[PDB]
């Protein structure tokens, strides 16, 4: 079927044909929808049709479907799968696969940029020291003195499952979290477990509120190893407020480079368990979730107090006032330090434009409303009013288990 | 489908187990290859004899299970009396007790409603003896006055006769009992509520004389027994309204905003045991954001962010200053303050969502689940600083239920 999606603000109706091409499951059925579940539920024989499908859409994308080059590649991949229990992507294929996995990421609001992605091939890597060198170069390239540039670094694909390359950090750059005797938590509570694994591995914690975690790198199934990122490569921003001169005294900072390192890139049936990728921040990521989640840095009440707000009744919306002021500060700080950042109004605007683009040239755009709508001021951004269809296209980024649950030393 | 499904809360790590989904009765719109969770709405004939039997049995069984009389003499006797009735008259009539049970459970089952902690406290008015539009008018006035209660609002539903052959439907043509008119001007601007322009034009055609103001209460347009609909003015003393003022900004009063106290949906269809109640207006009380964020600040609605931002002396040329966000909070502070001051029941989105989490947890324990539509349950401002944002939810359709239905002017055969 052709499916329609309506924007209820503009009455614009788009027509989705692209969904007919998906094979992977969403988790929903005709009787139960799991649209708000965060994580719902290879061999020679499995591997070839997947390989064939990806190769097919690649040569289709470059308008050479059924070409001699196409036929040979199909033949080449078959004999290699047969003889080696796997196969290797051409460079052009790797780049195409990585850009399209971003393009297909239904939960990403930043996808208007999908084709501007710098791809670093690290499939010749064999050691954690190698991984560290590769990741350092990535961080340096992507940070670019504040003029952030999208990048992905791709390490060797999974083979027998026992020689996995893994970045054990969930992001390349995050702040430590410490469990106080107090019972309270210093730093970022989200990272308390990982911080303790690093300490247990020999890392000497400064026990501060914003200590950059070391890299914990696993290469070829071996034990992971600790590395400190050279600090001149770690760009950070002191958060200050344009009208509240007391905001600086709060002592808040964040890092400029968002770099997810715990996901799995899947291309043509090949699995890349280590593929750190980075872009730039949407302000709410920091100002709403990182800072104001009860299970994170949880600063709302501190801020509302310096704002001298009545905090006795919820209906004074003191939390909503403090939240807006915090997010103003973050945007103002990054902008003032010339560090790339986008606000949720601009970002969601761009995404509606991107959707339109994708429907026009590709016949659809998979999108996850639950994730796309910003965590504050939802209905005054255009994506709130935009119906979206969610479905799974490959190449893709997938979740994988945390390494400390499968690996033994 | 698996017998046990798990939902997690990511803020509190609390995990809940759902078994109620097994009783799901029809389509969500989703398939295993595509999710339609953000789609708003995913023949003039009626249920046949053979279609009606198992639907009725299913409901009656469920009713007698709820009163701990499953398999009793009374249960089996009711089943037989219903069956005889469907067989000889092609339909059947609900007992008052079943009617009340069914309405309460349609609310309880309403996956998009955050106020369901209140579901068992619902005044049901049986208007199945109604025959004319004047009678519908009488019943609706009585509803409004009861539910309003001088500002101490009480949830209520009034239920008109069920559908028979489909050519004799009772319908309230209004989408809500109380709403403000909208008027398209020759120059393209809109006066009043742009959402209601179509319906307003219908009323005007039907004989209504429009004051052509910013907040004119619309008349009722009421259809009884499949006849042409008729106009009635709701007595203005029965329409409680709240002028919007702000605790700090004294200029806010000058914006001349007000809203009505009673939210009352009148265009949905109530389905009980396969019976179809096409006119079933129900009402509760407002969550502040419904008015402060959607009614006032949607671009296609009253759209007042700009005017408010101006009076707040905010820098409005860069989006990153968050001038829209700042004014939105203030508008919603005013709405809550104005309702509380006039002692009209209202709930803020923090209190409401926390109550719904408690409600949901209780439902999981006593009922084995609680269907919920995250896209609708999460508030339209400040989403992640409410507890429902972090709550995984399962969405599925149980019956009895409230359902959407075509707009009556689209289907009506004019006499
Ligand atoms: C360039 C600027 C970018 C912006 C502004 C952006 C924005 C976002 C945001 C706000 C989210 C929600 C994540 C959360 O709430 O935790 C997200 C998710 C995601 N992004 Fe993007 N992103 C950008 C670049 C990228 C790049 C370069 C990639 C990969 C090459 C990418 C892949 C993804 C994926 C796979 C998700 C889903 C996360 C999950 O399922 O956990 N994004 N993005
Ligand atoms: C008593 C206090 C109540 C509160 C605070 C409340 C709150 C809400 C809210 C905020 C919505 C979303 C509305 C929107 O965004 O348009 C909603 C939807 C809904 N409510 Fe409740 N409600 C209440 C009472 C009731 C009652 C008494 C019923 C039925 C007997 C009911 C049935 C529904 C239904 C069926 C929807 C679905 C909306 C749709 O799909 O169009 N509610 N409610
Ligand atoms: C269990 N989830 C693990 C991954 C969590 C995650 C995945 C992808 C993105 C994010 C948010 C961080 C981010 C990443 C990127 C590339 C850009 C951005 N603005 N923000 C978190
Ligand atoms: C397509 N229109 C169908 C009805 C739209 C609608 C249904 C249910 C609720 C609402 C919002 C009004 C409302 C009703 C009730 C009972 C309570 C409340 N807080 N708010 C709109
Ligand atoms: C329960 C729900 O799935 C979960 O809280 C989601 C909701 N939407 C989100 N949206 C974004 N962008 N990021 C998130 O982490 C989440 N969390
Ligand atoms: C496209 C999207 O489903 C639509 O804008 C929804 C989003 N969530 C909503 N949530 C509520 N409570 N009410 C609404 O009208 C909507 N609109
Ligand atoms: Zn779904």
């Amino acid at each position: 079927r052709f499916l329609k999606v309506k924007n209820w603000e503009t009455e614009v109706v788009l027509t989705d044909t692209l969904h007919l091409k998906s094979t992977l499951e969403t988790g929903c059925t005709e009787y139960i929808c799991m649209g708000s579940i965060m994580h719902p539920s290879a061999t020679k024989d499995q591997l070839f049709p997947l390989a064939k499908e990806f190769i097919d859409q690649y040569y289709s994308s470059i308008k050479r479907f059924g070409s001699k080059a196409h036929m040979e590649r199909l033949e080449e991949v078959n004999k290699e799968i047969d003889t080696t229990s796997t196969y290797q992507l051409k460079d052009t294929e790797l780049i195409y696969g990585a850009k399209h996995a971003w393009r297909n990421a239904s939960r990403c609001v930043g996808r208007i940029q999908w084709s501007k992605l710098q791809v670093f091939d690290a499939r010749d890597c064999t050691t954690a020291h190698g991984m560290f060198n590769y990741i350092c170069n990535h961080v340096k390239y992507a940070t670019n003195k504040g003029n952030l540039r999208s990048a992905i670094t791709i390490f060797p694909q999974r083979t027998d499952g026992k020689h996995d390359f893994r970045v054990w950090n969930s992001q390349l750059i995050r702040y430590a979290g410490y469990k106080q005797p107090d019972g309270s938590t210093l730093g970022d509570p989200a990272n308390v477990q990982f911080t303790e694994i690093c300490i247990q591995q020999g890392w000497k914690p400064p026990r501060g509120r914003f200590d950059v975690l070391p890299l914990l790198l696993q290469a070829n199934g071996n034990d992971p190893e600790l590395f400190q990122i050279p600090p001149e490569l770690v760009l950070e921003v002191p958060i200050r407020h344009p009208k509240f001169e007391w905001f600086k005294d709060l002592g808040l900072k964040w890092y400029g480079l968002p770099a997810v390192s715990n996901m799995l890139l899947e291309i043509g049936g090949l699995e890349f368990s280590a593929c750190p990728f980075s872009g730039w921040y949407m302000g709410t990521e920091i100002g709403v979730r990182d800072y104001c989640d009860n299970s994170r840095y949880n600063i709302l009440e501190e801020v509302a107090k310096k704002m001298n707000l009545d905090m006795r009744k919820t209906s004074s919306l003191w939390k909503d006032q403090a939240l807006v002021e915090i997010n103003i500060a973050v945007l103002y700080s990054f902008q003032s330090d010339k560090v790339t950042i986008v606000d949720h109004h601009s970002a969601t605007e761009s995404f509606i434009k991107h959707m339109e683009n994708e429907y026009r040239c590709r016949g659809g755009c998979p999108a996850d409303w639950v994730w796309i709508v910003p965590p504050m001021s939802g209905s005054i951004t255009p994506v709130f009013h935009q119906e979206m269809l969610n479905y799974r296209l490959t190449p893709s980024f997938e979740y994988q288990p945390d390494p400390w649950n499968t690996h033994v030393w």
Side-chain angles (χ1 to χ4, degrees), chain A residues 81-343:
Chain A
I81 292 178
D82 197 282
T83 44
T84 54
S85 291
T86 184
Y87 76 109
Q88 306 292 321
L89 296 170
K90 286 286 202 289
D91 284 355
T92 51
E93 299 169 354
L94 186 65
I95 299 166
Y96 171 89
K99 293 180 179 192
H100 278 251
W102 184 10
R103 192 194 190 167
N104 291 336
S106 65
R107 295 175 165 178
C108 176
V109 68
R111 277 181 288 161
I112 190 160
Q113 292 283 331
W114 73 268
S115 70
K116 272 47 189 171
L117 175 72
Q118 184 62 35
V119 178
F120 293 112
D121 186 1
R123 289 174 295 166
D124 63 348
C125 201
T126 69
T127 69
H129 277 84
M131 296 180 69
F132 171 71
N133 180 241
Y134 265 112
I135 286 167
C136 277
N137 292 341
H138 178 132
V139 168
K140 190 167 179 173
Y141 171 89
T143 294
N144 189 39
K145 299 264 178 56
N147 190 9
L148 307 191
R149 295 185 294 213
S150 295
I152 187 165
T153 293
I154 302 177
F155 293 105
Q157 73 211 32
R158 170 173 291 150
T159 48
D160 68 339
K162 318 193 218 307
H163 304 95
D164 277 9
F165 282 74
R166 291 297 297 266
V167 180
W168 280 38
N169 317 47
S170 54
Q171 304 180 7
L172 297 182
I173 293 183
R174 302 206 65 180
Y175 297 120
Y178 307 96
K179 208 56 189 54
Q180 294 297 80
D182 189 336
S184 59
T185 293
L186 176 63
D188 193 347
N191 298 317
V192 166
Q193 189 182 50
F194 180 77
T195 291
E196 291 174 12
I197 301 171
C198 293
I199 294 175
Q200 177 256 324
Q201 278 313 105
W203 183 65
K204 315 303 179 177
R207 297 216 132 79
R209 205 172 158 202
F210 299 103
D211 309 341
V212 176
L213 284 161
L215 288 173
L216 191 53
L217 302 186
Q218 159 185 350
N220 201 78
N222 289 292
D223 291 1
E225 311 176 19
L226 282 178
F227 303 94
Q228 178 214 30
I229 305 161
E232 69 270 32
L233 298 191
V234 178
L235 175 59
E236 290 183 309
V237 184
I239 310 309
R240 39 195 189 281
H241 197 278
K243 280 136 199 309
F244 291 140
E245 272 174 4
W246 49 257
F247 202 99
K248 340 180 184 304
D249 297 324
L250 294 182
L252 304 187
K253 61 162 67 182
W254 208 252
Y255 48 90
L257 185 70
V260 163
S261 47
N262 62 5
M263 288 194 78
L264 188 145
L265 169 57
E266 182 191 323
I267 300 176
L270 301 182
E271 304 187 306
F272 297 98
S273 50
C275 57
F277 57 87
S278 67
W280 54 81
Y281 265 121
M282 180 168 79
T284 49
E285 289 179 87
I286 299 166
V288 191
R289 309 291 317 278
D290 294 335
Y291 279 172
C292 298
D293 279 8
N294 287 310
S295 58
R296 298 297 298 289
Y297 275 85
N298 197 20
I299 73 177
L300 273 187
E301 68 187 299
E302 177 158 4
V303 180
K305 285 190 199 191
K306 295 237 130 264
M307 293 187 63
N308 297 137
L309 292 177
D310 202 327
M311 296 169 59
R312 292 189 267 200
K313 285 251 211 287
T314 55
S315 66
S316 76
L317 305 199
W318 62 269
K319 283 196 186 168
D320 315 66
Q321 276 184 274
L323 186 64
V324 171
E325 296 304 318
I326 289 161
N327 281 274
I328 282 170
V330 172
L331 291 175
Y332 179 73
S333 291
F334 274 63
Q335 287 173 353
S336 291
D337 282 4
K338 312 306 166 58
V339 174
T340 307
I341 196 172
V342 63
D343 69 76

Side-chain angles (χ1 to χ4, degrees), chain A residues 29-98:
Chain A
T29 79
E30 318 204 319
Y31 291 99
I32 304 136
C33 172
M34 306 197 191
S36 65
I37 304 300
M38 189 172 304
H39 311 300
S41 292
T43 81
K44 279 178 39 187
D45 311 282
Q46 316 185 272
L47 197 66
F48 181 76
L50 302 178
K52 178 214 186 318
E53 185 184 16
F54 167 76
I55 296 302
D56 279 341
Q57 82 169 52
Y58 169 70
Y59 277 92
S60 176
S61 67
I62 62 178
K63 290 176 302 293
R64 295 262 175 217
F65 187 93
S67 70
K68 185 186 172 66
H70 186 183
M71 280 167 154
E72 287 168 298
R73 184 65 185 139
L74 280 176
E75 164 79 320
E76 198 182 5
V77 172
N78 186 47
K79 310 199 80 149
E80 182 173 341
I81 292 178
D82 197 282
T83 44
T84 54
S85 291
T86 184
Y87 76 109
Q88 306 292 321
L89 296 170
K90 286 286 202 289
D91 284 355
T92 51
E93 299 169 354
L94 186 65
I95 299 166
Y96 171 89

